[PDB]
Design a protein around this ligand. Structure first.
Ligand code: F3S
Ligand SMILES: [Zn+2]
Ligand SMILES: [Zn+2]
Lengths: 47, 90, 49, 66, 254
């Protein structure tokens, strides 16, 4: 369950194994994180 | 392409072709109007959402409607072969 | 009106519609009582695996 | 947002003509001559090149982290 | 008979002398529809941070034309299982990067995009994109991305004659069918007429316009996927296949 720190655009990355009070990234105090795209191949038919 | 026959007779025929758009129907209508003996030939697209045409042929009785359709197909094939031969030399 | 379907197939008026679903893990009076966000195993009202 | 690959009316590629047309029009040349000598004579393609916004330049700043 | 008018880049204009209008229209319709052209069918996205979503990018890749003159015989038509593969794997570093169609690596070297100047997408800072597209032959009936011609025209053969000298006809007619040389009204491009009848409307007695029954003008503009002559030949071949199959079914029914 990897995450991404929302500071600027796609600031580094986070792992759920990292434990901090509340929701924060260790790198900066920004309070917003996002889930990353899962590393799986996706079939997208071109209509 | 599926084919279905309706109201077939010696001089009158109706025939539904599934899978052909306006192109084949118009080609066949032109060749049917070209072949002698055919009193009235016309295709129709009953619904544009469905890709299936209906060809109605009425003949004077000298030749069968199915034979008239076959002659029209032969004429169209001759035209296509001539067109290929003339384009290749161009 | 009649619209060219070939134009539509080239992206003439293709659009995207975005819908948002949001929740809050609200805490209500009690002993450390919270609505923890977690996948469900065997609790009541279970929709189906 | 980004210029379409092909003209909507006729399936003619106009995406590759965006950069030359835009660069030369921004340089100080009237769009008519640039379009005529670029290789687009049908006005269906001209409206594709003329009426474009290039939103994608602004969006790359506001991109979903995903 | 077929007479070439002008053969420009990706454009072909012919005059057909003895062919019914129905056959010529069927030829143009089959050129748009029933000629197979290689194009992207499915896209596999390993990673996508681009501003464009997955479906938008897949559509843009599908609309990109690939040269497939030698791919018709080496690849099975869709009615028959052999698909080409094209890779796109790039990443920006610190500045926006507009990635074009030239950096579309293909498994088969003969199959490449028509032009390398086609801009696929623009990437922001530190944005990586990686995908594999599976190209497949297909007809224009299934989708318009498979059409080999951007435009196909079938129009009547014009016969325009000047009867006396008229100064208005040179400026009335939208086409350059009329010219005024040495104070005489003459026709420069007779075959450029479109039978608009403005030339006849403002000066009725000075000019006579008619259409030639047997002759027609057939124009096709390719997109680079195929040669125009090959497009016409393939359209005629598809018409022949359809007619032969219909004849076989009619004979079987009898
Ligand atoms: S373009 Fe041509 S034939 Fe008649 S009215 Fe206009 S002249
Ligand atoms: Zn951070
Ligand atoms: Zn156009």
């Amino acid at each position: 369950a990897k995450y991404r720190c929302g500071k600027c655009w796609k600031e580094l990355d986070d792992d759920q194994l990292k434990t901090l009070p509340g929701v924060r990234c260790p790198y900066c105090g920004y309070r917003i994180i996002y889930m990353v795209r899962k590393p799986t191949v996706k079939i997208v038919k071109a209509i | 392409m599926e084919i279905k026959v309706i109201k077939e007779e010696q001089n009158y025929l109706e025939l539904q072709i599934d899978g052909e758009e306006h192109t084949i129907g118009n080609l066949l209508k032109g060749m049917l109007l070209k072949v002698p003996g055919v009193k009235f030939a016309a295709y129709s697209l009953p619904h544009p959402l469905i890709t299936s045409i209906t060809i109605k042929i009425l003949t004077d009785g000298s030749i069968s409607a199915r034979e008239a359709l076959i002659k029209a197909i032969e004429l169209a094939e001759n035209y296509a072969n001539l067109f290929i031969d003339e384009v290749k030399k161009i | 009106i009649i619209m060219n379907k070939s134009s539509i197939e080239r992206g003439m008026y293709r659009s995207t519609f975005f819908r948002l679903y949001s929740t809050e893990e609200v805490k209500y009076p009690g002993g450390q009582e919270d609505k923890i966000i977690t996948p469900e195993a065997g609790v009541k009202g279970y929709k189906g695996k | 947002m980004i210029i379409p690959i092909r003209c909507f009316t006729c399936g003619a590629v106009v995406a590759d003509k965006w950069e030359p047309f835009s660069n030369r029009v921004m340089g100080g040349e009237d769009p008519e001559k640039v379009l005529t000598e670029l290789g687009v004579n049908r006005y269906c393609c001209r409206r594709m090149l003329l009426s474009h916004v290039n939103i994608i330049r602004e969006i790359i700043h506001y991109t979903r982290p995903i | 008979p077929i007479s070439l008018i002008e053969r420009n880049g990706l454009r072909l204009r012919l005059v057909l002398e003895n062919y019914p209008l129905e056959f010529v229209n069927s030829i143009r319709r089959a050129s748009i529809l029933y000629v197979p052209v290689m194009a992207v069918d499915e896209v596999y996205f390993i990673e996508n941070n681009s501003p464009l979503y997955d479906e938008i990018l897949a559509h843009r890749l599908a609309l990109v034309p690939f040269v497939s003159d030698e791919a018709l015989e080496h690849y099975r038509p869709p009615e028959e299982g052999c698909y080409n593969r094209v890779y796109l794997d790039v990443e920006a570093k610190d500045q926006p990067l507009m990635i074009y169609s030239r950096d579309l690596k293909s498994e088969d070297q003969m199959i490449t995009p028509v032009s390398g100047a086609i801009p696929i997408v623009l990437l922001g800072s530190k944005q990586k994109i990686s995908l594999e597209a599976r190209l497949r032959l297909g007809y224009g009936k299934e989708h318009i991305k498979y059409s080999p011609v951007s435009v196909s025209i079938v129009r009547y053969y014009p016969k325009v004659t000047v009867l006396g000298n008229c100064e208005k006809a040179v400026e009335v007619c939208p086409e350059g069918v009329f010219a005024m040389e040495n104070n005489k009204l003459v026709v420069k491009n007779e075959l450029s007429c479109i039978l608009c009848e403005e030339c006849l409307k403002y000066c009725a007695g000075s000019v006579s316009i008619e259409s030639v029954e047997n002759k027609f003008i057939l124009e096709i503009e390719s997109v680079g996927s195929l040669k125009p002559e090959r497009i016409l030949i393939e359209a005629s071949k598809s018409l022949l296949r359809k007619l032969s199959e219909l004849k076989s079914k009619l004979e079987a029914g009898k």
